Amino acid sequence: DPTIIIPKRANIPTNDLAARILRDVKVELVYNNSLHYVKIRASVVLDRPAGQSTNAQTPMSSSAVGV
Amino acid sequence: EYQDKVVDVEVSLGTQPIDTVGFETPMFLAMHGNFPERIRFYVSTAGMVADGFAVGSPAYQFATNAFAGNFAPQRVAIGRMSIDSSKVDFTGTTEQVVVNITLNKVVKAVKINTPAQIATALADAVTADADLTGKATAVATGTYVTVTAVSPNVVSVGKGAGVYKIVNESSETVATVLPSVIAENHNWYFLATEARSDADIVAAAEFAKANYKLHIYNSTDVDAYAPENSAASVFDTLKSLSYDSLGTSDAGADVDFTEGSVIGAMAANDPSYGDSLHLKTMPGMVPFAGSDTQRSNAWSRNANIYRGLYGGGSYIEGKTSSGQYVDVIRFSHWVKFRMEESVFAYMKRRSDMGLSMKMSDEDLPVLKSVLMNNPINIGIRNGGILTGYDTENKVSYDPTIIIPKRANIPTNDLAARILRDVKVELVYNNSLHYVKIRASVVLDRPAGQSTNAQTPMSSSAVGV
Amino acid sequence: EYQDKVVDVEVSLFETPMFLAMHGNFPERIRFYVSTAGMVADGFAVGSPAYQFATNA
Amino acid sequence: NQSKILTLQAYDPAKVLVFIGGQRVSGFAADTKIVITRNNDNISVHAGVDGEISNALSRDNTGVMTLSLQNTAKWNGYLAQWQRQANVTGLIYLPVQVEGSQGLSLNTIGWIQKQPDLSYGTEVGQMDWEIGVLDAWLSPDQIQGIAAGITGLL
């Protein structure tokens, strides 16, 4: 999310009140990106594809073994 | 003074600012000659390299490790000792060796491709660089190459690529240097040393206890987890003296000086919360690889170990040399410093308007409110200080303050004009370190429970 | 008597009975202690009758 | 356990700043200055017969911002004239900003939805203008942000 910050009067040095110029205003942004290159991976099958695994469990995220 | 535009914008691509935090500046006593002062303050590694520090040098490694923590400070203090020479030990094995060496603002990266042969080749390569020969010197011996700078020149040597050590030698002793260092600036809290001899560590530990500083050291020793009967390591040495110092075993402690990671995980942590170091993650450190018995030995010797669990890395047990938890020591130091600072600040403001404080019953009691402000209340608000009624011992934890009356002050103190015998009490909270669970599983139909509906009686009536 | 610090903190984490013990730890026929810590400093072996009496009292 | 003060400063109503189009509003009513309410619920719930629960987010962020002003305030004229100016020219949108003193804030686009009734009586009257808001998400302006990555679970 874009952000904007403005300093308060108590934080302005006395010198700037004579110069009458404010400083330290800050803004932030995130730039998007276009797409330049793409790489694809195809596959071809000739004979009868082999039967797939018949597991119906919901795939677990990671191994439980950890110490 | 003159601005040509009513509104101006500096577009900085990628970089971002960071807020200003309060912290305790650490001090790293390194040996070098890059500047004359005994101690300097840096805010980024860029400034250190701009001062002639070679990339990969001890101070650079310590700084880059310190600035990477979740609680890292924004200033680092670098001490200075004398320097006689430096060593590049190739003991071990190694394909490409790169050594970064900077000589009198001149930066170069010597290159090389059995340890003795590698050392000899590196020494020959160093002499090939005419600039290095004119201003610096190199000699081979065994598995290490010794390099020395010509007197009017400053040389800095740091790690590049490959496996080897970098050891700097200096005639100045830590015990002699620290008293001079503290004189220039007392504005630092953590203490670290580059030299890793037993005598230097013992001297630093003795100094820290006297001057109210916290000492940290990584030992890189292998006896640290030797069987419990082998009381021959520095860790066991410090126990006998009852000193306090947060020491931990590691493998890269003499190639990276990992004290920076610990400091960065400790610098910006407010002691008022009593936030122990039990499970804090630290970048840079490498997991301890020993087995269970080695870990048990290390724990018995109070040598903390970094361990990896469930994919992450975690410190453990935060214990000090004397056996007391580092958290308690930090809390005690925090109380000791801030009670004094608060009282002094009130007294100075009260005496700066005239009407300085006087020793009488009509003015002394205000110290109760003065002390109940600042530490005694911030600690309660942040949870560091405990309050309430104890049900077991039938005692209360409420903080207490007592002030003596004028009639009880001896006549001598009225001449010395100093008050004594002010008493305060506190109860410290505690974090949670270990937990043990008891589970149960049932397979068949559980048996029917007792159907008693009476209110359970407390204890048997039979007693005479 | 110089005091280098304006404020400093430590942060440090009735009738009297008489017991006629037999020993040779001091010359006087009587002495007064405020705890067993003072007794041990005089060489009183832990668990000795006088030490036991004091710690019980 | 001791009672804790929820804040260091004191909630000052005068510190609440309302900027409509770049100018500060003045001359507020007695009790309440502004009220912000969402038009629709954030999340809907569909409950099946068997007990299965599924939810769908709501993308309707329109809201209403009540604004109370004394009938003697000069800002009544500004809004009244702007109403006809927008009606004729066809431009109704204008920025709206609210700064909280010790609470949430708001910064979005808005428009005038309904003109309040006018009543003349013994005492000074009150007018409660209604200002629409494109998005009614109250945003924080505090140290919040380091804990939002902690409450997360499941």
XYZ file of C-alpha atoms in Angstrom:
742
model
C 0.000 0.000 0.000
C 1.402 3.468 -0.830
C 2.434 5.430 2.255
C 2.818 9.145 2.991
C 4.374 10.730 6.088
C 4.419 14.386 7.140
C 6.503 15.781 10.030
C 4.959 17.798 12.833
C 5.749 21.383 13.777
C 7.533 20.411 16.994
C 10.079 18.428 14.943
C 10.951 21.271 12.534
C 14.261 22.980 13.429
C 14.071 26.694 14.161
C 16.247 27.466 11.133
C 13.638 26.197 8.664
C 10.992 28.444 10.243
C 13.227 31.350 9.199
C 13.966 29.863 5.777
C 10.239 29.025 5.586
C 10.948 25.721 3.794
C 9.705 22.301 4.889
C 11.726 19.098 4.516
C 11.631 15.362 5.217
C 8.355 14.531 3.459
C 8.510 10.833 2.589
C 6.608 8.720 0.060
C 6.887 5.063 -0.930
C 5.748 3.113 -3.977
C 6.004 -0.318 -5.595
C 6.412 -0.523 -9.360
C 4.711 -3.186 -11.461
C 6.492 -5.231 -14.150
C 5.818 -6.256 -17.729
C 6.453 -9.739 -19.120
C 9.457 -10.155 -21.415
C 10.301 -13.853 -21.825
C 8.399 -17.121 -21.468
C 9.574 -20.733 -21.433
C 7.313 -23.746 -21.935
C 7.686 -27.475 -21.294
C 5.610 -29.737 -23.522
C 5.218 -33.512 -23.571
C 3.946 -36.090 -26.051
C 2.591 -39.597 -25.496
C 2.578 -42.391 -28.071
C 1.538 -45.662 -26.417
C -1.143 -46.112 -23.778
C -0.199 -43.904 -20.797
C 0.529 -45.880 -17.656
C -2.177 -46.039 -15.019
C -1.848 -43.281 -12.446
C -1.644 -43.794 -8.695
C -5.086 -44.249 -7.148
C -4.380 -42.440 -3.877
C -7.404 -40.401 -2.768
C -5.904 -38.815 0.355
C -5.546 -35.065 0.633
C -1.830 -34.422 -0.054
C 0.015 -33.691 3.178
C 2.117 -30.546 3.362
C 5.440 -31.683 4.845
C 7.028 -34.544 6.747
C 6.211 -34.721 10.449
C 9.658 -36.031 11.441
C 11.521 -33.017 12.798
C 13.489 -32.355 15.956
C 20.562 28.524 0.979
C 19.121 29.270 -2.449
C 16.487 26.898 -3.840
C 15.808 27.085 -7.570
C 12.544 25.098 -7.404
C 9.493 25.653 -5.231
C 9.066 21.863 -5.008
C 11.792 19.277 -5.528
C 11.750 15.486 -5.440
C 14.641 13.032 -5.138
C 13.600 9.712 -6.703
C 15.618 6.973 -4.997
C 15.172 3.681 -6.839
C 14.804 0.605 -4.654
C 16.253 1.901 -1.399
C 14.107 2.581 1.667
C 14.677 4.428 4.957
C 14.501 2.989 8.464
C 13.238 4.586 11.662
C 15.434 5.690 14.572
C 15.441 3.195 17.447
C 16.842 3.338 20.971
C 19.507 0.771 21.732
C 22.792 0.011 23.462
C 25.857 0.424 21.268
C 28.183 -2.609 21.341
C 31.966 -2.333 21.412
C 34.333 -4.607 19.474
C 37.980 -4.365 20.529
C 39.822 -4.955 17.249
C 43.527 -4.566 16.504
C 44.533 -2.352 13.574
C 45.952 1.044 12.673
C 43.368 2.604 10.345
C 42.727 5.618 12.614
C 44.490 7.208 15.608
C 41.538 7.412 17.990
C 41.020 4.636 20.519
C 37.316 4.238 19.687
C 35.043 5.299 16.818
C 31.335 4.959 16.051
C 30.074 3.707 12.682
C 26.513 3.467 11.358
C 27.073 1.162 8.374
C 29.682 -1.121 6.859
C 30.036 1.373 4.002
C 31.648 3.873 6.361
C 33.973 1.214 7.757
C 35.190 0.185 4.300
C 35.581 3.866 3.411
C 38.028 4.059 6.341
C 40.341 1.463 4.796
C 38.858 -1.662 6.367
C 39.281 -4.678 4.106
C 36.186 -6.656 3.163
C 36.023 -9.839 5.199
C 38.192 -8.420 7.972
C 37.215 -9.220 11.577
C 35.634 -5.832 12.281
C 33.751 -5.904 8.977
C 32.399 -9.393 9.689
C 31.319 -8.392 13.193
C 29.571 -5.258 11.936
C 27.757 -6.987 9.077
C 26.606 -9.712 11.468
C 25.428 -7.186 14.065
C 23.419 -5.099 11.602
C 21.459 -8.151 10.366
C 19.601 -8.989 13.581
C 15.933 -8.464 14.353
C 16.988 -6.147 17.207
C 20.150 -4.801 15.609
C 21.502 -1.435 16.805
C 22.167 1.550 14.569
C 25.689 2.318 15.833
C 28.724 0.107 16.414
C 31.830 1.023 18.403
C 35.196 -0.216 17.116
C 38.153 -0.266 19.474
C 41.784 -0.077 18.429
C 44.914 -1.907 19.570
C 48.469 -2.012 18.280
C 49.253 -4.378 15.411
C 52.537 -6.187 14.739
C 51.625 -8.481 11.830
C 48.931 -10.833 10.551
C 48.678 -14.500 9.613
C 46.806 -16.414 6.915
C 46.799 -20.043 8.076
C 45.881 -22.657 5.466
C 45.883 -25.611 7.874
C 43.212 -28.012 6.647
C 42.281 -28.518 3.008
C 41.013 -26.470 0.081
C 39.746 -25.071 -5.341
C 40.306 -21.331 -5.805
C 41.759 -19.262 -2.971
C 41.055 -15.519 -2.901
C 42.438 -13.165 -0.242
C 41.296 -9.550 -0.090
C 44.144 -7.271 0.997
C 44.058 -3.476 1.169
C 47.285 -1.500 1.621
C 47.280 2.266 2.221
C 43.995 2.878 0.420
C 45.137 0.469 -2.306
C 42.770 -2.478 -2.767
C 43.870 -5.735 -4.377
C 42.690 -9.355 -4.439
C 45.570 -11.830 -4.639
C 44.659 -15.213 -6.101
C 45.964 -18.775 -5.899
C 44.953 -22.221 -7.142
C 48.622 -29.625 0.283
C 48.443 -26.520 2.498
C 52.194 -25.832 2.456
C 52.269 -25.594 -1.344
C 49.252 -23.266 -1.359
C 50.876 -21.046 1.269
C 54.152 -20.862 -0.664
C 52.322 -20.066 -3.902
C 50.307 -17.324 -2.193
C 53.451 -15.826 -0.662
C 55.147 -15.795 -4.066
C 52.068 -14.209 -5.644
C 52.001 -11.460 -3.007
C 55.594 -10.499 -3.798
C 54.673 -10.388 -7.494
C 52.518 -7.290 -6.871
C 55.070 -4.483 -6.929
C 52.736 -2.211 -4.961
C 52.449 -4.804 -2.192
C 56.224 -5.316 -2.058
C 56.988 -1.598 -1.886
C 54.505 -0.953 0.912
C 53.934 -4.422 2.402
C 55.788 -7.679 2.996
C 54.984 -11.387 2.813
C 56.798 -14.549 3.897
C 55.851 -18.223 3.821
C 56.319 -20.724 6.637
C 54.683 -24.110 7.066
C 50.964 -23.850 6.348
C 50.630 -20.102 7.025
C 51.783 -16.925 5.295
C 52.903 -14.012 7.476
C 52.381 -10.512 6.075
C 53.691 -7.286 7.579
C 53.229 -3.692 6.479
C 56.101 -1.278 5.965
C 56.055 1.224 8.807
C 54.409 4.263 7.119
C 51.745 2.060 5.500
C 48.524 0.507 6.788
C 47.574 -2.971 5.549
C 44.210 -4.676 6.027
C 43.664 -8.332 5.112
C 40.271 -10.002 4.878
C 38.650 -13.224 3.769
C 37.798 -13.765 0.107
C 36.978 -17.328 -0.948
C 38.254 -20.670 0.287
C 39.062 -22.168 3.678
C 41.657 -20.549 5.943
C 42.084 -18.456 9.074
C 43.021 -14.815 9.592
C 44.822 -14.118 12.873
C 46.258 -10.761 13.918
C 49.010 -10.481 16.528
C 49.594 -7.489 18.786
C 51.890 -6.705 21.708
C 49.306 -4.595 23.547
C 47.439 -6.527 26.228
C 43.690 -6.205 26.688
C 44.081 -5.456 30.399
C 46.302 -2.468 29.601
C 44.161 -1.188 26.721
C 40.659 -1.345 28.197
C 41.341 1.210 30.984
C 42.389 3.699 28.307
C 39.457 2.833 26.035
C 36.893 3.409 28.784
C 38.407 6.845 29.427
C 37.622 8.137 25.929
C 33.969 7.019 25.979
C 31.876 5.163 28.538
C 28.820 5.226 26.250
C 28.607 1.522 25.396
C 27.191 -1.574 27.047
C 28.296 -4.779 25.310
C 31.943 -5.866 25.343
C 33.622 -8.051 22.720
C 37.245 -8.878 21.951
C 39.054 -10.029 18.827
C 41.890 -11.846 20.588
C 40.729 -15.297 21.679
C 43.518 -16.358 24.039
C 42.461 -17.568 27.473
C 44.242 -14.720 29.261
C 42.543 -12.040 27.153
C 39.099 -13.533 27.791
C 39.745 -13.783 31.528
C 40.973 -10.182 31.631
C 37.899 -8.954 29.752
C 35.622 -10.889 32.105
C 37.340 -9.416 35.166
C 37.120 -5.901 33.711
C 33.433 -6.189 32.805
C 32.334 -7.171 36.315
C 34.170 -4.164 37.774
C 32.916 -1.631 35.215
C 29.323 -2.918 34.882
C 29.411 -4.221 31.322
C 28.119 -7.382 29.649
C 30.755 -9.694 28.172
C 30.204 -11.974 25.170
C 32.601 -14.491 23.631
C 32.490 -17.365 21.147
C 35.060 -20.042 21.911
C 35.259 -22.257 18.772
C 36.899 -24.843 21.047
C 36.336 -28.585 20.787
C 36.843 -29.401 24.480
C 33.704 -27.337 25.125
C 31.616 -30.530 24.884
C 34.168 -33.012 26.224
C 33.032 -35.458 28.927
C 32.030 -33.752 32.161
C 35.181 -34.864 33.998
C 37.448 -32.982 31.545
C 37.598 -29.611 33.306
C 40.140 -28.108 30.928
C 38.264 -25.608 28.718
C 37.840 -21.860 29.141
C 34.168 -22.415 29.966
C 35.147 -24.470 33.010
C 37.853 -21.919 33.809
C 35.290 -19.132 34.150
C 32.980 -21.224 36.346
C 35.644 -21.560 39.039
C 35.910 -17.756 39.228
C 32.115 -17.267 39.463
C 32.296 -14.707 36.656
C 29.372 -13.756 34.419
C 29.751 -13.913 30.644
C 27.465 -15.201 27.906
C 29.714 -17.773 26.225
C 28.670 -20.206 23.507
C 30.440 -22.807 21.384
C 30.401 -22.537 17.599
C 32.351 -23.529 14.491
C 32.689 -20.229 12.602
C 33.444 -18.072 15.640
C 37.004 -17.418 14.416
C 36.175 -16.817 10.729
C 33.055 -14.693 11.224
C 33.086 -13.546 14.874
C 29.434 -14.441 15.388
C 29.132 -12.211 18.461
C 27.424 -9.821 16.063
C 24.428 -12.111 15.664
C 23.933 -12.408 19.430
C 24.266 -8.651 19.878
C 21.773 -8.043 17.073
C 19.363 -10.421 18.795
C 19.973 -8.581 22.090
C 20.683 -4.899 21.377
C 17.195 -3.424 20.898
C 15.400 -5.681 23.411
C 14.006 -3.732 26.354
C 14.792 -5.558 29.634
C 11.542 -4.297 31.172
C 9.623 -7.137 29.485
C 11.889 -9.870 30.840
C 12.142 -11.293 27.323
C 14.537 -14.241 27.583
C 16.692 -15.415 24.682
C 15.436 -19.006 24.789
C 14.210 -19.478 21.210
C 15.340 -16.313 19.416
C 16.500 -16.915 15.856
C 19.834 -15.418 14.818
C 21.104 -15.072 11.232
C 24.682 -16.041 10.498
C 25.119 -18.808 13.056
C 25.343 -22.459 12.001
C 23.480 -25.293 13.783
C 25.360 -27.364 16.348
C 26.145 -30.786 14.882
C 27.039 -32.899 17.920
C 24.947 -35.753 19.268
C 22.901 -35.995 22.455
C 25.794 -36.768 24.809
C 27.798 -33.833 23.464
C 24.828 -31.529 24.047
C 24.471 -32.831 27.602
C 28.154 -32.148 28.254
C 27.877 -28.645 26.799
C 24.870 -27.901 29.001
C 26.740 -29.203 32.043
C 29.567 -26.773 31.229
C 27.161 -23.838 30.623
C 28.235 -23.533 26.967
C 25.176 -22.439 25.004
C 24.589 -24.094 21.630
C 22.670 -23.030 18.536
C 20.365 -25.847 17.444
C 18.146 -26.360 14.421
C 14.623 -27.659 14.976
C 11.720 -28.181 12.576
C 13.608 -26.435 9.775
C 14.647 -23.331 11.707
C 17.501 -22.321 13.982
C 17.136 -21.450 17.652
C 19.352 -20.460 20.564
C 18.881 -22.462 23.771
C 18.657 -21.779 27.488
C 20.428 -18.406 27.438
C 22.546 -19.403 30.445
C 25.653 -17.574 31.649
C 28.923 -18.855 33.089
C 27.878 -18.551 36.743
C 24.620 -20.423 36.065
C 22.281 -17.438 36.347
C 20.101 -16.647 33.349
C 21.281 -13.694 31.277
C 17.774 -12.236 31.489
C 18.068 -11.727 35.249
C 21.458 -10.033 34.885
C 20.108 -7.662 32.245
C 17.084 -6.832 34.394
C 19.270 -6.107 37.417
C 21.534 -3.826 35.382
C 18.504 -2.049 33.910
C 17.031 -1.366 37.349
C 20.391 -0.276 38.744
C 20.982 2.218 35.941
C 17.511 3.700 35.584
C 16.613 4.155 39.252
C 19.813 6.187 39.599
C 19.181 8.173 36.422
C 15.622 9.027 37.469
C 16.641 10.146 40.956
C 19.525 12.242 39.626
C 17.305 13.847 36.992
C 14.746 14.837 39.618
C 17.403 16.183 41.986
C 19.140 18.234 39.292
C 15.880 19.790 38.122
C 14.930 20.546 41.729
C 18.281 22.244 42.436
C 18.450 24.104 39.107
C 15.638 26.448 40.200
C 17.063 27.064 43.621
C 15.179 25.457 46.490
C 17.522 22.458 46.438
C 16.410 19.432 48.433
C 16.974 19.525 52.190
C 17.274 16.706 54.730
C 13.956 16.915 56.554
C 10.877 14.759 57.016
C 8.827 17.309 55.061
C 10.723 16.820 51.781
C 12.258 13.333 51.828
C 9.024 11.362 51.229
C 8.703 12.706 47.669
C 11.348 10.146 46.714
C 8.570 7.568 46.985
C 6.667 9.140 44.086
C 9.893 9.875 42.201
C 10.908 6.206 42.310
C 7.385 4.884 41.702
C 7.637 6.887 38.486
C 9.997 5.589 35.794
C 11.265 2.048 36.511
C 8.955 0.732 39.215
C 5.852 1.484 37.112
C 7.129 0.814 33.593
C 8.185 -2.624 34.789
C 4.679 -3.361 36.048
C 3.038 -2.059 32.875
C 5.282 -4.122 30.587
C 4.956 -7.256 32.737
C 8.542 -7.452 33.981
C 7.607 -6.811 37.624
C 5.113 -9.097 39.342
C 2.257 -7.973 41.578
C -0.589 -9.552 43.494
C -1.205 -11.840 46.442
C 0.469 -15.239 46.776
C -1.949 -17.999 47.765
C 0.693 -20.571 48.777
C 2.951 -18.603 51.130
C 0.192 -16.072 51.941
C 2.435 -13.123 51.033
C 1.987 -10.133 48.727
C 4.286 -9.136 45.868
C 3.461 -5.417 45.984
C 6.598 -3.269 45.508
C 7.692 -1.511 48.693
C 9.732 1.626 49.388
C 11.060 2.809 52.757
C 12.713 6.117 53.649
C 14.432 6.846 56.990
C 13.505 9.834 59.117
C 15.762 12.705 60.138
C 15.937 11.609 63.777
C 17.518 8.308 62.671
C 20.287 9.883 60.551
C 23.663 9.925 62.361
C 25.234 13.337 62.875
C 28.165 12.396 60.635
C 25.978 12.105 57.528
C 24.566 15.593 58.147
C 28.152 16.820 57.740
C 28.839 14.558 54.759
C 25.394 15.592 53.466
C 24.723 12.087 52.087
C 21.678 9.954 52.863
C 21.787 6.167 53.234
C 19.618 3.139 53.997
C 16.933 3.673 51.349
C 15.376 0.266 50.692
C 13.353 -1.098 47.772
C 11.949 -4.552 47.039
C 10.765 -6.239 43.856
C 9.614 -9.604 42.509
C 10.772 -10.671 39.060
C 8.525 -12.527 36.628
C 9.604 -15.632 34.684
C 9.406 -16.847 31.107
C 8.484 -20.396 30.094
C 11.306 -22.618 28.844
C 10.204 -26.270 28.836
C 6.874 -28.094 28.701
C 5.979 -31.750 29.215
C 2.697 -33.342 28.146
C 0.933 -36.601 28.995
C -1.385 -37.955 26.315
C -3.632 -41.013 26.273
C -5.389 -43.073 23.610
C -8.440 -45.327 23.840
C -9.249 -48.192 21.481
C -12.190 -50.194 22.844
C -15.276 -48.806 24.549
C -14.102 -46.815 27.600
C -15.294 -48.281 30.878
C -18.249 -46.632 32.564
C -17.196 -43.950 35.019
C -18.218 -43.795 38.669
C -21.662 -42.247 39.101
C -20.961 -40.431 42.370
C -22.675 -37.026 42.431
C -21.397 -35.809 45.809
C -19.247 -32.714 46.057
C -15.693 -34.073 46.521
C -14.598 -33.734 50.135
C -11.300 -32.013 50.849
C -9.518 -34.309 53.315
C -10.150 -37.173 55.706
C -11.826 -36.250 58.984
C -9.909 -38.846 61.027
C -7.165 -36.903 62.788
C -5.985 -36.697 66.374
C 34.874 9.362 50.554
C 34.568 10.418 46.919
C 31.371 9.111 45.314
C 31.725 8.893 41.539
C 27.985 8.414 40.950
C 25.139 10.741 41.895
C 22.673 7.819 41.925
C 23.640 4.152 42.164
C 21.600 0.955 42.278
C 22.578 -2.556 43.352
C 19.883 -4.672 41.655
C 20.960 -7.485 43.982
C 19.113 -10.578 42.738
C 13.697 -9.161 71.675
C 15.401 -11.482 74.147
C 18.552 -13.325 73.128
C 19.395 -16.952 73.969
C 22.800 -18.314 74.935
C 24.098 -21.760 73.960
C 27.010 -23.206 75.944
C 28.870 -25.070 73.220
C 32.267 -26.733 73.627
C 34.873 -25.641 71.084
C 38.006 -23.564 70.602
C 37.071 -21.335 67.673
C 37.552 -18.056 69.581
C 39.136 -16.974 72.885
C 36.265 -15.019 74.423
C 33.888 -16.797 76.771
C 30.965 -15.503 74.673
C 30.208 -14.017 71.260
C 27.164 -12.708 69.400
C 26.242 -13.715 65.843
C 23.435 -12.466 63.607
C 23.331 -15.586 61.395
C 25.121 -18.839 60.635
C 27.013 -17.023 57.873
C 28.879 -15.195 60.621
C 29.479 -18.494 62.417
C 30.990 -20.300 59.430
C 33.406 -17.401 58.926
C 34.727 -18.324 62.392
C 35.329 -21.907 61.247
C 32.183 -23.558 62.606
C 31.784 -26.892 60.842
C 28.364 -27.198 59.221
C 26.204 -29.555 61.240
C 28.110 -28.919 64.455
C 25.875 -28.572 67.534
C 26.242 -24.790 67.779
C 25.546 -24.327 64.068
C 22.474 -26.565 64.318
C 21.123 -24.636 67.294
C 21.582 -21.279 65.568
C 19.991 -22.396 62.307
C 17.029 -23.891 64.168
C 16.573 -20.718 66.220
C -3.398 -6.394 38.966
C -3.454 -2.597 38.636
C -5.564 -0.437 36.347
C -3.753 0.757 33.219
C -4.194 4.007 31.305
C -5.209 3.103 27.761
C -3.383 6.114 26.283
C -0.749 8.707 27.132
C -2.434 11.716 25.517
C -6.084 12.721 25.934
C -8.714 12.393 23.214
C -9.264 15.990 22.077
C -12.254 16.500 19.730
C -10.710 19.690 18.328
C -7.795 17.633 16.961
C -10.114 15.731 14.595
C -9.603 17.379 11.200
C -12.044 17.053 8.291
C -10.808 18.142 4.850
C -13.455 18.311 2.114
C -11.846 19.373 -1.154
C -8.745 20.757 0.562
C -10.350 23.070 3.147
C -10.928 22.474 6.852
C -14.549 22.288 7.998
C -15.593 24.424 10.965
C -18.759 25.139 12.909
C -19.785 21.682 14.089
C -22.805 20.633 16.143
C -22.897 19.971 19.890
C -22.824 16.227 20.553
C -21.473 14.331 17.527
C -19.304 15.662 14.707
C -19.201 12.788 12.198
C -20.509 9.221 11.955
C -19.222 6.633 9.464
C -21.178 3.460 8.690
C -20.833 0.670 6.143
C -23.818 -0.089 3.929
C -23.431 -3.884 3.804
C -21.910 -6.703 5.827
C -18.302 -7.632 5.127
C -18.802 -11.405 4.793
C -21.921 -13.449 4.041
C -22.507 -16.977 5.334
C -24.307 -19.846 3.588
C -25.338 -22.700 5.893
C -26.365 -26.045 4.438
C -28.839 -28.538 5.832
C -26.078 -31.003 6.741
C -24.126 -28.213 8.472
C -21.533 -27.348 5.824
C -20.546 -23.673 5.974
C -19.250 -21.561 3.091
C -18.668 -17.809 2.959
C -18.250 -15.206 0.223
C -16.620 -11.797 0.497
C -18.522 -8.577 -0.198
C -17.066 -6.044 -2.639
C -19.585 -3.256 -1.899
C -17.586 -0.696 0.094
C -19.963 2.256 -0.310
C -20.799 4.054 2.919
C -22.464 7.138 4.374
C -20.690 9.841 6.400
C -23.060 11.942 8.493
C -21.915 15.519 9.094
C -23.571 17.814 11.641
C -23.264 21.592 11.304
C -25.008 24.515 12.958
C -27.426 26.305 10.650
C -25.466 29.515 11.325
C -22.207 27.990 10.066
C -20.842 29.435 6.836
C -20.122 25.982 5.383
C -23.850 25.531 4.740
C -23.561 28.032 1.895
C -20.519 26.340 0.367
C -22.200 22.931 0.203
C -25.483 24.410 -1.031
C -23.756 26.245 -3.883
C -21.612 23.226 -4.757
C -24.774 21.120 -4.979
C -26.197 23.262 -7.784
C -22.781 23.679 -9.416
C -22.412 19.897 -9.650
C -26.023 19.515 -10.788
C -25.420 21.907 -13.686
C -21.875 20.982 -14.730
C -22.228 17.267 -13.936
C -19.156 16.793 -11.712
C -20.085 15.521 -8.250
C -16.943 13.821 -6.906
C -14.467 15.512 -4.573
C -11.801 14.222 -2.165
C -12.671 13.560 1.474
C -10.207 13.116 4.336
C -10.584 12.570 8.086
C -7.794 12.596 10.677
C -8.383 10.838 13.978
C -7.027 12.128 17.265
C -6.596 8.781 19.054
C -8.443 6.501 16.650
C -8.787 5.376 13.046
C -8.734 7.663 10.008
C -10.221 7.811 6.505
C -9.117 9.093 3.096
C -11.280 8.413 0.030
C -13.533 10.105 -2.540
C -17.039 11.231 -1.660
C -20.100 13.158 -2.764
C -23.172 14.854 -1.313
C -26.043 12.357 -1.116
C -28.870 14.196 0.677
C -29.380 17.729 1.954
C -30.580 17.838 5.584
C -33.888 19.372 6.569
C -33.968 22.952 7.854
C -35.988 23.937 10.927
C -36.256 27.334 12.620
C -37.136 27.468 16.304
C -36.414 29.078 19.661
C -32.842 27.744 19.734
C -30.190 27.506 17.037
C -30.999 24.717 14.601
C -28.841 21.850 13.393
C -28.231 20.341 9.954
C -26.953 16.789 9.407
C -25.453 16.578 5.925
C -24.908 13.123 4.429
C -21.706 12.624 2.423
C -21.138 9.436 0.470
C -17.788 7.656 0.386
C -16.470 5.400 -2.368
C -14.732 3.167 0.197
C -15.584 3.113 3.910
C -12.500 1.249 5.170
C -11.189 2.957 8.303
C -7.400 2.814 8.165
C -5.041 2.994 11.164
C -2.294 5.554 11.725
C -0.470 3.893 14.626
C 2.383 1.471 15.388
C 0.036 -1.293 14.231
C 1.601 -3.544 11.612
C 4.155 -5.550 13.574
C 1.443 -7.698 15.206
C -0.817 -8.349 12.202
C 1.725 -11.005 11.217
C 1.262 -12.669 14.614
C -2.497 -13.112 15.040
C -2.480 -15.162 11.833
C -3.320 -18.827 12.364
C -5.009 -21.704 10.558
